[PDB]
Amino acid sequence: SITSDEVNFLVYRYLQESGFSHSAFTFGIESHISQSNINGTLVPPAALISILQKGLQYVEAEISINEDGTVFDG
Amino acid sequence: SITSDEVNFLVYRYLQESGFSHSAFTFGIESHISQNGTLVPPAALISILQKGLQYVEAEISI
Amino acid sequence: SITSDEVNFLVYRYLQESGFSHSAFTFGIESHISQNGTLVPPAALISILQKGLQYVEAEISI
Amino acid sequence: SITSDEVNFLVYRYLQESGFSHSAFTFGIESHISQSNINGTLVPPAALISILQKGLQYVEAEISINEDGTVFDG
């Protein structure tokens, strides 16, 4: 369950991968990214997008299981 | 399927809310965040990412 | 009497020319540099500052 | 005769004094201001504006001395 460093690294990498050059620079400094303890070479591309995707899907599935209810509800 | 604009708005709000003043300012421009917010509550990037890890841990428990 | 806009344009051009990419970008917005350039040649902040020190050294030689 | 560090410090202080918060931040990092060797407490307010002023005046005076020429020119 997710730390500030982890979300900061995910965001930093999103800005980099999307060519948000000015934001990447400012954010790397403001979030103190160099002092974080994450091995970037082990972080796959589109990691933020992908986890966030799966978050949306996860909520959709949490909803759809209770979507119909049962014919015995009362 | 999450769009670019949607991700961008989610991180913009995260930057604002986390007090990353200079990043929010710069990202707001670079994003062209047209400079419904109302439907994006606080901590929304974080909340969705948290659901995503829950989902990843479900694939890892296959 | 140098105006704000004039100083701002002089530093904006200095930031651009010196390769301070992120500062120029951010300053261009913060300055509202309306986003005649043609009349402001390269190294113009520097050249005027250099004349100013020449003038300061003339007051120091009073 | 003026170094990059000096003009960078002058500019940094201009952005600060004018409340250009976002630019000051970015520029302090990009110009590596912390590694410069200038004692800020000895730098007066509006220093950039003032030296730049005096530069304009200095050029005006360089011009005005040759403005009329003489009645013996030929």
Total strands of chain A: the figure is 0
Instruction: Please tell me the CATH architecture of chain A by its name.
Output: Up-down Bundle
Span of the ends, CA to CA of chain A: 37 Å
Radius of gyration of chain A: 18 Å
Q: Number of domains in the coordinates of chain A?
A: 1
How do the SSEs of chain A run, as a string of H and E? HHH
Name the assembly state.
Answer: homotetramer
According to CATH, what is the class of chain A? Mainly Alpha
Summing up helix and strand content along with how strands pair, one would put the structural category of chain A as mainly alpha
Major sheet summary line of chain A: none
Strand content of chain A: under 5%
Question: Number of helix segments of chain A?
Answer: 3
Q: Identify the most extensive interface between protein chains.
A: A-B, 29 and 31 residues
- The name CATH uses for the topology of chain A is Mitochondrial Import Receptor Subunit Tom20, Chain A
Shape of chain A: elongated
**What's the helical proportion of residues of chain A?**
55-70%
Family (chains B, C): Belongs to the WD repeat EBI family.
Protein name (chains B, C): F-box-like/WD repeat-containing protein TBL1X
Domain LisH (chains B, C): 3-35
Subcellular location (chains B, C): Nucleus
